[PDB]
Every structure is written in C-alpha cells, then in structure tokens.
Amino acid sequence: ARYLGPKLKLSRREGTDLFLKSGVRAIDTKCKIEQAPGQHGARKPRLSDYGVQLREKQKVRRIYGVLERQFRNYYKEAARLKGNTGENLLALLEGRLDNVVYRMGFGATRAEARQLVSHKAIMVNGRVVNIASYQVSPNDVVSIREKAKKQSRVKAALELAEQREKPTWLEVDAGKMEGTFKRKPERSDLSADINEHLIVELYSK
Amino acid sequence: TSYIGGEGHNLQEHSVILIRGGRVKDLPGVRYHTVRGALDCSGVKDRKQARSKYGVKRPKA
Amino acid sequence: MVTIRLARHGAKKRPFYQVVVADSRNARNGRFIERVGFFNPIASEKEEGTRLDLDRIAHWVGQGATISDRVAALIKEVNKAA
Amino acid sequence: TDKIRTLQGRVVSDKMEKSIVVAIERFVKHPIYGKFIKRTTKLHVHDENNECGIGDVVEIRECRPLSKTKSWTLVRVVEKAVL
Amino acid sequence: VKAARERFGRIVQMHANKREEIKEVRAGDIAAAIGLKDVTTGDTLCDPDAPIILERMEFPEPVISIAVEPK
Amino acid sequence: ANIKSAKKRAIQSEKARKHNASRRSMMRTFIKKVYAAIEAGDKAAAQKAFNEMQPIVDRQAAKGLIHKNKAARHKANLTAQINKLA
RNA sequence: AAAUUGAAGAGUUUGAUCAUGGCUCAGAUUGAACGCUGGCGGCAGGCCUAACACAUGCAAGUCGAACGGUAACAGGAAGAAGCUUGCUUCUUUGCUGACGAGUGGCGGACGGGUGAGUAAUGUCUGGGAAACUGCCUGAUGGAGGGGGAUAACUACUGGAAACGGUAGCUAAUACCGCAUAACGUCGCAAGACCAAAGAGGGGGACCUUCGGGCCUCUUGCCAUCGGAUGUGCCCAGAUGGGAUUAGCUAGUAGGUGGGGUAACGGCUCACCUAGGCGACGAUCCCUAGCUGGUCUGAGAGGAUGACCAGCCACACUGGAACUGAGACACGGUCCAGACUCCUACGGGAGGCAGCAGUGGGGAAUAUUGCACAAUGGGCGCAAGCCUGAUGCAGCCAUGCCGCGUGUAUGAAGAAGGCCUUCGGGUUGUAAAGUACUUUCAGCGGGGAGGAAGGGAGUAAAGUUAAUACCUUUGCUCAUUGACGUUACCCGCAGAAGAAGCACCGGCUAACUCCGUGCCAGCAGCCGCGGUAAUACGGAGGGUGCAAGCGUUAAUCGGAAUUACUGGGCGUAAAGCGCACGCAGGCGGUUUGUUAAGUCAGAUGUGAAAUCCCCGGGCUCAACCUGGGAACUGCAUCUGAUACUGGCAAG
C-alpha cells in the first residue's frame, strides 16, 4: 500500500523526530511535534515493554515507510544471509533504490523520491527502472530521466541537497544528475535514533 | 445447539442456517454459533463499528 | 530405444528447455535417464542459452538413440563443426 | 569374496530334512533411543543330507529360489553343537 | 438491468422441447442459452455500452393463497 | 456414442484365434501322440514319433504360435524321456 | 568453498505463598470455507465431499512411396453433342492428382485420469540369478521357388433398424506349402530341424507386350548374436493401530518324481514325508495407496503424502481369456451382474475415477474456450495427417509477491466533530489556497521472443550404371505465431478513475464521552453488566495491518504436559502386597584369539527439482534457472583392535 492521510501525525505517536515533511516550516512550527496526538496526548504514556519494542520496529518501518509484509521479508534476509542480523537488516533495507534517489537528494522527502522512481523518471545503469524498492547493487550509476531534470520537485530538492548531503558510501553529482552508489551498510553507514537489536529480539519469537 | 450472536432477534423458526464452531461457555452445551450474515437469518440490524462478525454491509452513502 | 529430445521447464512464454536422454513411451517431462545439456530459446541480452555435452551424445548414439527433430536442430544451433 | 552373499548363522531346527532352519542374531541401534539391540532374522536354507543339527553354527549363501521362502543353500558347518 | 459482466455460454434453438444447434444469435430470432443461471424474466441483455433496461416490466399478481408443508 | 476405430482389429483377432487354435491343436494332438508314444514303450515307434515332432514344433516356433523358449522346452523334455525308456 | 548464533513467555487455583498440575493465550502454516471490503500486473494453485448418476460435442490414428481396387471428388485427356470457332457442355477412359470402404501393415498395452482396493502375494533401500524384450543399434549369415483361400467387388436376399445373410470371383509386404538351414535349435554324439517379400525412386546399356525381365541405388523383410532400454522374478532390512485379537496353518511346511510358465517355484500335481508360522506379536480385527517430498520444529521429534515427481492399484460392478513383443486391456472382446437407451415390439445398444459441462453430494472449487504455431506422443521414406497430452487464453484477491492509489507546499491553528476544572485542548498541515508531476488505469501511435523447421533450386563431398536417382556439408530463393493489437516503448489528458478491515479492561499495542441498568449484550481466557460501564451499543480520539482484513476449521510448536535428546514415583498422579523364577535385560577379573557390533578408509549407490549455497535472467521481487553442497541411509572390500559381543584356557 501507500500509507497516507495525516503524515506528521504518525511520527508524533512515534514520539521523537523523523525525517518527514522537510520542505519547509514543519519542525516545531505550525505542527506540534512533541506532546502526543489525539485527545489523550496531553497526559503522559502508559507504555509497555512490548510497546517500546513494537513502536521502535514501527519507527524504523516508518522512517523508510515499508509495509510489514516487506519488512518480514527484510528480516528474512538478514537471517538468511551470513552477517549479523540487526546491522545487516539496516543494510538490506537501505539498498533500496527509492531511498537512494532520496539519499542523492533528488527529492528532499522520500515520498518525493518514491513518486519520481515509480512515475518513471529514474534510470539505473542507463536502464529504465521504476521498481521502487529495487536492489541497487554496490557500485552502480544513478541517473535521472532527461525530462525530469527540471520539475519543481527536482530543482528545489537539488538545492535542498546542496551542502546538506554527500555521505560516506555514495558520492553524487548535481549538474550531471548522477550519483555513484558506493556500497551497502555495515554497522557504521546508517542510523538515526533507531533500535535494531530490539527488533531482532521482536522478530525471533 | 448453537448460540446466536447479536441482537435484532433470532430468525427462522423452521429454516436454514450456516453454523460455525465456537463456545460461549456460560451456557450449557454451546459449541456453535450461527453466522448471521451468511445464508439466511439476516445480518444484525443496525450497528456501525462491529460489523464483520455478524454482517453489516458498509452503512450506506 | 530412447531419445535425445527436449524437456520443457520454467514459465509462461519464457520456457527453459533442458535437454534429456529419455524413455520412448513416456511424458516429455516424465521420467529420464541422463540429463545432458541445457537449452534456452530466450537468449535475449544474455549468453549461455545453449550448453551441451557432445561426449554423452556420442555415447547414446553408438548404443542406439534417435535425436529429435528439434534436438537435431540444437546440433544445427551449436555450430562447432563449421 | 568381491560381492557374494555369504553369511554365518545359528541352526535352530532340523526336523524335516532338506529344509534346514537357520536363525541369525543381528545387532542394530534402536533408531531413536540408542541401545544396540537384537532382532533375530530367521531363514530357510537348503539342506541336502542332514549335515546340520540343532545349536549348530553354519554358513549359508544365496542360491536362488528352490521352494517357497527357500532360496539359500547351506555352505559349511563351522561348529556342530559338539553332539 | 443488474449491471454485471456476462458470457453467453452456448446458444441452442428449440424444436419441440428437444435441442437444435445453431452457434450464434442475430436480430429477430428466439432461442435459449445454456446454463446462464442467474437471470430473471424481464432482464435485458445488451451490447457492451448496452441499452440498459427496455420498457417491458408489467405482469399480474397472485389471486389466491394456500399454505404448504412437505410430508 | 460408439467404438473408435477398433473394429478391424476386433474382427481380425478372432480369425487369428481360430488360426492359432488350429495349429496349436495340430501340434497338441502331436504332443499327445508323443507321450502316448512314450507309453507305448518302444524306442523305435516313439523316436519315430519324436522324429515326427521335430519338423512339427519348429515352424510353430518360428511363426510365433509357441515362439520364445517355448519350443525348446517341449522339444527337450520329452526327447530324453524316450531315452530313459529305452 | 558453505554447516553458520529458528534451543522467549504470559494469565488462571490462595487471604497471600512456593510447589504440583490441567486449561487458555501471543508464532508460523492451508487444496481452505465465510462474513466486510476491494485498483493493477505478475506467478502459482483451483471438487479434499459421492470412486455418485452422467445430457451434448470432443480426448487415437495412419500408410495409395503394402494390396485388390476405383463410389467419391478433382484435373488432364479420346470421341461426340451444342457448335461458340475452338470454346462450353456431355459420354467414356485410373490417364493423373487421388482416395470412401475393404483385404492387409503398424500405433489403440504410450500419453491422461483416478486412490476404490491393498498393511508391500506391487511400495522404500540395497543386494540377487533363473529370465524375456517390437522398434532402435552392432556384427555375421539369408532371402530360391511355388500353392491356395478370402475381404471388397459383384449377383442374390433379410431386417421399420442396429446389424445382416445366401452365391460366385480376385491380390498382396495377409495365409499356406516347398527349397535351402548356422556361430543356431534339440541332443553324448551320431543325427534331426525350422526362415523371409517384396516394394519404391531411378536407369547410362542389353533383353523385351519398356507389361516387364534386367541394370542401379534407397528401403523394407528373414536366421543367429550382442548392444540398449523396458518389463517378469527373488532375498534381507524399514512401514499405521488394537492382545478387552493368542494359538494360526495342511497344497500348509519340506522332499521325491511327472506337469507347467518366457523362467526357478506345491506355480500345479500325484506320490510322499511331517512339518512351517507365532509374544523379536503369527493370526484376527480396525484403519491406510506409496515414496521423493510437503508442513512444522533448534535439533531430535511430530504431523503429512494429486502442488510436483518416480512408484503402484483401479477402469459401470463381477469374472475370464484372447490378441500381441508388450495386457489380462481408460475410449476391445466374452460371460454374468446392477443401471440406463432405441424400438422396431421382433430384437439390439451403452459406461465422463479422459476434456469441457450437467444434475446429486457438500462449507467449498472453474471454460460445453483458442490452436497445432512451439514442445512432445502416434503413423508415415517424407510432404503430411493425427494431438481436450501440450502450450496459452477464459473464470475465482485462493495463496505468494510486486506495484498504484499524486507529491511537495500549506493556519498561526478555519467550519463541522469531540471532550471542556468553559481556561481551552483535540481532530490537524488534516482541510481550503499554492506550485510540481502522471506509475497503473483510460486513451492514440510504434512493437522483442517464442521461428527452430520444412518446401523447391544450382552445385558437390559422394553410389557415382559419368553429367540420373539418391545424398548431404553448405550454398539458393520464396518462407513458418494458438496467445495477439503480448510484454516492451513512445505519446496525450488530469490531482485526477481508486482503500478497506479489525482492534483499544489485563493477557495484547490503544481511550474517552454518551446510550442500557443482571438487562440489552460481549467472552480465546480471566470474566464483565445489578446507576457515572476504559468490556456491552454508538460518537469522538487512538493502535494494528492492508487489497485485503477478521473469524471459525486444520497441523506443529509454545508443551520439558508421553520427556531418546528431556520428566516422575514418602505425602501432590505415581513402587506391584510379598517372594521364587522362565524368557529377556544386564556381567567381577585375566590371558589369548576371533573380528560380529565398533571406528577409520575406499569404491558403488542416495533419480529430477525440492531444501540449503554461490551465480544468472524476466525493469526487481514473486519467479525461473547453471553449478556447488547437502543427498542425516544402505552396499562391499581393505583397515584400526581399546571398548563390547563371540570363542578357548584362568
């Protein structure tokens, strides 16, 4: 599906930050970002230990926005593959092209990215790609459809990407609309406030 | 012996229902329920959030 | 008695053919005696759409086997005697 | 030698001639529990001559069916129950 | 009249109450379709951008009642 | 609903049965003559019967009416028996 | 080069506790059904119940390059007629393409479906010798010459029919005799013994009624003998449940000799003779296709056995055999049986546990589809025909997965909704406005792969009776799509064409107002409801998951609660009332030895794919696929002799 309706709201349940709605004035300003949502958001949480875990598997599910049936599969992969599960899972999740074009800064929120991959404005290795989740292999060309080097969603996100982004494990070029995806994560290459060991704990029984 | 969930009366003094396993333990003998939205014995009249069990079609618009 | 004939495998209009020494009087992906090659009629933007074992074929023919109308045409396709 | 069916066995009956009854004690470990335990496989062997008696140890070998169940023939008597 | 997607499984023409074979039905013919079990009298069956309902609907109501029970 | 095209196979096999059965009998009366010739006890008349059998069986063998190793078994068993009743 | 960290717990007994112990819960799985809802594509699956009857059509033919032949159709064609002026039309001609039927040849015993029977008289694993086997292939050897019959046809003659019948004639590569007759066949050997067919394409010379002998190649056919592949058989070991099933068995157990199968065998039989099987569970009865494998699970284990694939049993129900290389026959026969159909009223027909579909069953499961094109089966010298196998498409959110349902901006925090200590929060940047963009869908254009092949042609390797025919390497030219207007690609509109379902007392993430007052009503468990209900009914708010969601059914786990890995027995369930002792379980201590277990090694085996692993391709993934490795086992040989068992002496 594509999980929509009230977007910073979902994040306010998650109850810290999140990398959403990042064009303009949102980050405590015209949105309340702390408290908690709804009519019983003013008082403090009941919580539950099952809660803290499930809510952090949700967090990370929401910062990348995938569904459980995909995430169940990324857990399968981290187990299935020979490397440490919680770290490897972040890696396995990250290698998705739709976050990569976002990591390129060709959008400045993922949904911007996800739309232009899907609505077929991205090309990987010079080959037409719209599979959003796609495995970008370590050391691949990222390129954007000629026609798309001009959308207000493109230009604005390029300046948003400007002096914002350029990570360890991809390298990027703005005039040429190009990026070199260097590799997948080991431990070091990705995070935020996220829990990885709590989810493997959760998915394992 | 089947229990019959929901309000809006039983129906069918002498006709056909589909039944399903399941206890409600405070009665004697109940092992079964009738599916009110299936075959006859009409889906339970009114209601607005508890609809799937004891069928209520999407309440119109 | 047997044949060297193609067996079909894979999926809806991307079949893979897998090449087989098999009993004459059984399904074309029934039972079989030795598996002797691979054939892909989908060669599209890829190599290795034909791989086959000459030594086995020769074994089978000197004992007594018919190679099929398409399998004789895989010979035509392997082109290592021209 | 090199692949033939030749076995050793205990003789547990002689009572009609030309039949002879040879019981084989085999070990196997019981397939779930361990414990190497016995089952005794009991076989028809062609006698020809009353060379065998009871409590004896014999050698028997495959020789293709001669009568129902009865396909083994007697080779040699190791030990004769010293009667 | 329902607004539903149909197939005419095969069509047969009636001679006596025995079944004569044709393989299609054109304008101005009467016939039967074989199976096609849902429809009720006064339904209209039309082309893919259908005349939706034709006028027809009208027939009489039941004068006298009895109660039935099986044996 | 009808029989596919089995008919012509269907009829032939009865003609063939009768044909076999005749030569099968032809030999049979002879096989019986051989043992009754063993009982008559004579080497000479009974080997004369065997000598009559040796042409009779072999064409049954060749033409597929007893075939296989079937001929051979009949040929041999009886042939020796004549010698055990010299 | 792949084994490799899948070995959670929670609530419930009491005033309260530790224990003991049953129940319930969160996980994964499905050939699923149902309710509520529902966009696309891909892929995969779709009667588990009645193996219950089946309407209708279709699921097995083919050779005229076997043969007699010549209804059909078609063409060429002799002669006429009409005359058109040499064309239309007739007759007759197998002349030729061509072939209905028939004789005859090979394939209907393969493919497909079904799981009733059956506890393996088939199966799984290895090991066996007594065996058969059409094509196919390897080798030798042969194919000489003749006789009669009979279909059809044709006459006759019965039958409202189905299907005949009475009579005469004609062939073969059908039949039959004859020749010859092994490296064969039977057998001491002597000796006996049986075989076949031509036909076609062509002919470069000859014979000649160029009919046809013949010349030349292809090909067919026959004897032996191996091959290969299949099939018959055997032995041991593994395989569901009951002993509130304990004695079963004389063709049974064995032999002797005759008999018989393609072959050893009471397989069968007459003589014999007295066994065989059984608590290491015979027998009896219940249930049950098997297996690879699937599911589940750490593993061990448990569950499970049309999803695919090997195997096996079955064919309206029951018996028996035929024919054949192959069967006791899935669309054959024969008989009996139950049930159904024609009608002629005398007598005859038929089998959807093939494909589609009907009715009946049931919670529940499809299209009376497209096509021989690809693949493969069949017959064919090949063209060709034949293919409800087989490809697809059809129909079901039935599963699995991909992908969409605009995206960003955007209040000073708008109506409406809801609570409100009436302060104000919330619903919510949600909404409106803004800018950008259009997967899919819808709509216009372009369009990969599946196509390999065969036909006919020159030449030529080459038989080369020269340059024929054949034959093949290539070469020669025209030329192969069921799906299908398919993917795929380009273009054109627009924020548009499109999101549900369940849950919120604890277990279990999430929460309040108001409607009812033991009710109405919820319950997987604990329980709640008897005036302010976090359960009940709805509103707001909230959480979870999504083209689904929930729920009841089903397997395993959680469960160490049937425990080998891994439990217990004073009192919680739990030691026989006590003892002797048979079978079985178990064996102090030594030397030697043997070599069964034992362990190491080697070699054969464990089908395919599946599982697992490393690649690869379809825009990824689902999927599909190359090789690796597993393939927890058996086999036989060699070896190691401590341990144990055997065995001899302490």
Which of the other chains make 3 or more beta carbon contacts under 8 angstroms with chain E? Answer: none
- State this model's resolution in angstroms: 3.6
Q: Which of D64, D58, D24 minimizes the C-alpha distance to D43?
A: D24
CA separation for the pair F84, F86 (Å, rounded): 6
- How would DSSP label each residue in C2-66? -EEEEEEEEETTEEEEEEEEE-TTS-TTS--SEEEEEE-S--TT-S-SEEE-HHHHHHHHHH--E
Q: For G617, which residue's CA is nearest its C1'?
A: C46
Give the phi and the psi of residue A27 in degrees, each rounded to 5.
-70, 100
Distance A204 CA to G556 C1' (A): 17
> How was this one solved?
cryo-EM
Torsion of Cα atoms, A127 then A132 then A134 then A137, to 10°: 70
* Angle (deg, nearest 10), helices A68-80 and A49-63: 90
How far is the CA of A20 from the CAs of A63, A68, A75, C70, in angstroms? 8, 20, 24, 59
H-run or E-run covering D21 = strand D19-30
User: Domain tally for chain C?
Assistant: 1
Q: For G261, which residue's CA is nearest its C1'?
A: F70
CA separation for the pair D28, D6 (Å, rounded): 20
CA separation for the pair A157, A165 (Å, rounded): 11
DSSP A144: E
Torsion of Cα atoms, A162 then A167 then A170 then A175, to 10°: 10
Scanning every strand, the nucleotide with its C1' closest to A115's CA turns out to be: G407
Amino acid at A134: Y
Chain position carrying tokens 């991959």: A117
CA separation for the pair E39, E2 (Å, rounded): 9
Chain position carrying tokens 């004549």: F82
Q: Which of F68, F60, F72 minimizes the C-alpha distance to F28?
A: F60
Domains within chain A, CATH numbers bracketed: 7-93+190-203 (1.10.1050.10), 94-181 (3.10.290.10)
Which of the other chains make 3 or more beta carbon contacts under 8 angstroms with chain A? Answer: none
Scanning every strand, the nucleotide with its C1' closest to F75's CA turns out to be: G186
Distance C39 CA to G481 C1' (A): 21
Distance C40 CA to G453 C1' (A): 17
CA separation for the pair E53, A124 (Å, rounded): 54
Distance F56 CA to G177 C1' (A): 13
The sign of the torsion formed by the CA atoms of A11, A12, A16, A21 equals positive
List bases, strand G, within 7 Å of protein CB.
4-6, 8, 27, 34-38, 42-44, 55-57, 60-62, 102-108, 110-112, 127-138, 175-178, 181, 185-188, 191-195, 222-223, 226-230, 233-238, 253-256, 258-267, 273-278, 280, 300-302, 309-311, 322-325, 329, 331-333, 350-351, 357-359, 363, 367-368, 374-378, 389-394, 401-413, 417-419, 425-430, 435-440, 448-453, 473-474, 482-483, 488-491, 495, 499-504, 506-512, 520-528, 536-547, 549-554, 564, 584-586, 596-598, 607-609, 613-614, 616-621, 623-627, 635-638
Contact criterion met (CB below 8 Å) for B18 and B33: no
Contact criterion met (CB below 8 Å) for A120 and A85: no
Distance C8 CA to G629 C1' (A): 26
Tell me the two tokens of residue A124.
């990987």
CA separation for the pair F8, A200 (Å, rounded): 75
CA separation for the pair B57, D63 (Å, rounded): 80
Scanning every strand, the nucleotide with its C1' closest to F1's CA turns out to be: G350
Q: Which of A11, A58, A46, A56 minimizes the C-alpha distance to A32?
A: A11
Q: Give the three-state DSSP class for F62.
A: helix
DSSP A96: B
Scanning every strand, the nucleotide with its C1' closest to A88's CA turns out to be: G5
- How would DSSP label each residue in E39-71? --TT-----TT-----S----PPP---------
Amino acid at A41: G
Give the phi and the psi of residue C14 in degrees, each rounded to 5.
-125, 55
CA separation for the pair C26, C33 (Å, rounded): 12
Scanning every strand, the nucleotide with its C1' closest to A8's CA turns out to be: G429
HSE-up of A23 (CA within 13 Å, CB side)?
Answer: 13
CA separation for the pair E57, E38 (Å, rounded): 18
DSSP B54: T
Distance A197 CA to G556 C1' (A): 28
Q: After which residues is chain D broken (C to N over 2.5 A)?
A: none
CA separation for the pair D48, D33 (Å, rounded): 43
C-alpha R_g of chain D: 14
Distance D64 CA to G583 C1' (A): 35
Distance D67 CA to G258 C1' (A): 17
CA separation for the pair D70, A35 (Å, rounded): 91
Distance A205 CA to G296 C1' (A): 15
Scanning every strand, the nucleotide with its C1' closest to F52's CA turns out to be: G192
State which residues form the domain around C15. Answer: 1-81
H-run or E-run covering D24 = strand D19-30
The torsion region of residue A180 among left (phi > 0), alpha (psi -120 to 50) and beta comes to beta
Give the phi and the psi of residue C13 in degrees, each rounded to 5.
65, 20
H-run or E-run covering D46 = strand D34-46
Contact criterion met (CB below 8 Å) for F27 and F66: yes
Distance A188 CA to G85 C1' (A): 107
Q: Which of A112, A77, A88 minimizes the C-alpha distance to A98?
A: A112
DSSP A146: G
Tell me the two tokens of residue C38.
């691979």
Tell me the two tokens of residue A64.
């990348």
- Strands A140-144 and A178-181, sheet pairing: antiparallel
CA separation for the pair B28, B21 (Å, rounded): 15
Q: Which of D33, D11, D30 minimizes the C-alpha distance to D22?
A: D11
Instruction: Give the strands of the sheet with E18-21, arranged side by side.
Output: E18-21, E11-15, E32-33
Scanning every strand, the nucleotide with its C1' closest to C48's CA turns out to be: G626
Tell me the two tokens of residue B42.
């009409």
Tell me the two tokens of residue A142.
């990222």
Contact criterion met (CB below 8 Å) for C6 and C20: yes
CA separation for the pair E61, D27 (Å, rounded): 90
Distance A203 CA to G632 C1' (A): 29
Cα three-residue angle D42-D47-D51, rounded to 5 degrees: 110
Distance C79 CA to G477 C1' (A): 23
How far is the CA of A55 from the CAs of A93, A190, C18, C42, in angstroms? 18, 20, 50, 48
Which of the other chains make 3 or more beta carbon contacts under 8 angstroms with chain C? Answer: none
Chain position carrying tokens 């009886």: F78
The sign of the torsion formed by the CA atoms of A45, A46, A51, A52 equals positive
Bridge partner list, D39: D26
Contact criterion met (CB below 8 Å) for C49 and C41: yes
Give the phi and the psi of residue A187 in degrees, each rounded to 5.
-55, -50
Own/partner contacts of A80-84, CB < 8 Å, gap of 24 or more, are none
Which of the other chains make 3 or more beta carbon contacts under 8 angstroms with chain D? Answer: none
